[PDB]
Design a binder for this molecule. Sequence first.
Ligand SMILES: Cc1nc(N)ccc1Br
Length: 167
Amino acid sequence: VNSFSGYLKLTDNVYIKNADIVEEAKKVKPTVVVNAANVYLKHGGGVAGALNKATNNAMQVESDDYIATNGPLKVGGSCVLSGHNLAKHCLHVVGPNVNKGEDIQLLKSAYENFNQHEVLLAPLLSAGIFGADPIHSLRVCVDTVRTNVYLAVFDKNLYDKLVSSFL
Ligand SMILES: Cc1nc(N)ccc1Br
């Protein structure tokens, strides 16, 4: 049993809810929250900016030190950093950004990072300002992630469309 409440079960391991991810993390304090990161861990806007704002910029401070030591992530890659006040850990995952011309086939590689964690609170990778079709992102998630993933979709309209269209 876990603390996640109000989710729609899509499969054996994938659950979904219409929710503000900063609010859900604050309530649950999951072991792992996933950030929709870029390779520079520049959390300006999108899920990354919303999460970072909720940490009072401590996520960005920690991320800048990580990049100064290690250099940029790969598209499709990830790193584990602190979850600050939101979670034990934040898994920063880089999905391809269609608005930068990145290979959408890298979305499967991005979701494979989730398999290193037994339970996660996550957004749909490459959705929102990363420009991918969220219906596609949910299909890749279901077909790639084998660990237990709790997906938070910010937009009620999109949530209802993802559920209604789910095969
Ligand atoms: C305030 C916000 N903005 C986004 N772009 C995504 C999630 C959230 Br919460």
